């Protein structure tokens, strides 16, 4: 159970970058669930591309393609 590794201070800092002035005490568990759901959909795709190539090492390109298919093209990692 490593979901507890996303500590409360990090959540506050992220809300601060977004301009949030005051945060209710229940936002943390919802944010944890949202992050877990977002990660699962990307990881499943990355693993799918990795397996098709018969490689055992996950590569940056696999994540780049996985994000592009959902429309979240990421610039910077080649």
């Amino acid at each position: 159970d490593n979901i507890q590794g996303i500590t409360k201070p990090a959540i506050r800092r992220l809300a601060r970058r977004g301009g949030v002035k005051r945060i209710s005490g229940l936002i943390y568990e919802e944010t944890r669930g949202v992050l877990k759901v977002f990660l699962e959909n990307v990881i499943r795709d990355a693993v799918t591309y990795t397996e098709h190539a018969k490689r055992k090492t996950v590569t940056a390109m696999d994540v780049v393609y996985a994000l592009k298919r959902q429309g979240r093209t990421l610039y910077g990692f080649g």
């Binding site: 490593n2 996303i6 601060r16 970058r17 936002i27 944010t31 699962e40 990881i43």
Partner: protein
């Protein structure tokens, strides 16, 4: 004594973190979380050092965008405090 009024430090934090560009989540706890989720699909997986960073950047950009939207739908209700229903409403209108 001397003490700042509630919320002024928050505004100073907003002006600070909107100016900086570093990553805000701890690298090692996030790496362990990525390691834990991938294990359900395949065993003995390896991750390049840059892959976890790419995932972290994407997750932080997603949370930032979701919080930006949640703030708008929070002010709209004449509140300032964001709450779970604001996230659920934003996600519903966004179609997710």
């Amino acid at each position: 004594p001397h003490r700042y009024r509630p919320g002024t430090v928050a505004l100073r934090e907003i002006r600070r973190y909107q100016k900086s560009t570093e990553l805000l989540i701890r690298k090692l706890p996030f790496q362990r979380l990525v390691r834990e989720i991938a294990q359900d699909f395949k065993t003995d997986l390896r991750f390049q050092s840059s892959a976890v960073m790419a995932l972290q950047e994407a997750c932080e950009a997603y949370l930032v965008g979701l919080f930006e939207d949640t703030n708008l739908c929070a002010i709209h209700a004449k509140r300032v405090t964001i709450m779970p229903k604001d996230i659920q409403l934003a996600r519903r209108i966004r179609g997710e």
